[PDB]
Amino acid sequence: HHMLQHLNSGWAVDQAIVNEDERLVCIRFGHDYDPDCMKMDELLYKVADDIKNFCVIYLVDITEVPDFNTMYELYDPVSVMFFYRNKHMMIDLGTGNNNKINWPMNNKQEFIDIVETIFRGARKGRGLVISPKDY
């Protein structure tokens, strides 16, 4: 329990998470200039319209907005995290870090499937889902 829209303050992040009752909130916490972050953002732009009925994506440059860097141990240049009704959703991706997707993905359908799985689990009141695919 806590163009794509950038969030420019810890207040704005809090607000985006706490105010959304219907959809999964996807936050990309990153060092925006890093190539891995840029790679992940291309993917987010490609899938955003496909998932807009069940998921809203926000971008946060953690060099500018560092407020959650200890809270979520944000050491990586890209960490995609998911929230439903103010609850941080876990995703067992087979990597042994269930808190975040912290590598650039480049398969559009694979990511969409992960977002859908998280949403569907969240809607059942689950705090953790097993990714449709082992990573």
C-beta separation of 31 from 19 below 8 A: no
Under the binding rule (CB under 5 A), the answer on residue 56 touching Cl ion is: no
Of 30-38, 44-52, 97-105, 120-128, the segment contacting Cl ion by CB under 5 A is 120-128
5 binds Cl ion, rule: CB under 5 A: no
Is residue 128 within a helix (H) or strand (E), and if so which, with residue range? strand 128-130
Distances (CA, A) of 24 to 40, 64, 70, 95, 96: 18, 24, 23, 22, 22
User: Whose Cβ is closer to Cl ion: residue 58's or residue 111's?
Assistant: 58
CB-CB neighbours of 22 under 10 Å = 10
The amino acid sitting at 6 is H
Q: Does 117 bind Cl ion (CB under 5 A)?
A: no
Residue 8 binds Cl ion, judged by CB under 5 A: yes
Shortest reach from residue 96's CB to Cl ion, in Å: 17
Of 25, 30, 31, nearest in space to 54 by CA: 25
For Cl ion, the binding residues in 22-41 under the rule CB under 5 A are: 22
Task: Select the residue interacting with Cl ion from 2, 6, 10, 36 (CB under 5 A).
Answer: 10
Which position among 4, 18, 71, 128 is part of the footprint of Cl ion (CB under 5 A)? 128
Q: How far is the CB of 106 from Cl ion (least distance, A)?
A: 29
Cβ 89 vs Cβ 21: under 8 Å? no
Residues that bind Cl ion (CB under 5 A): 8-12, 22, 126-128
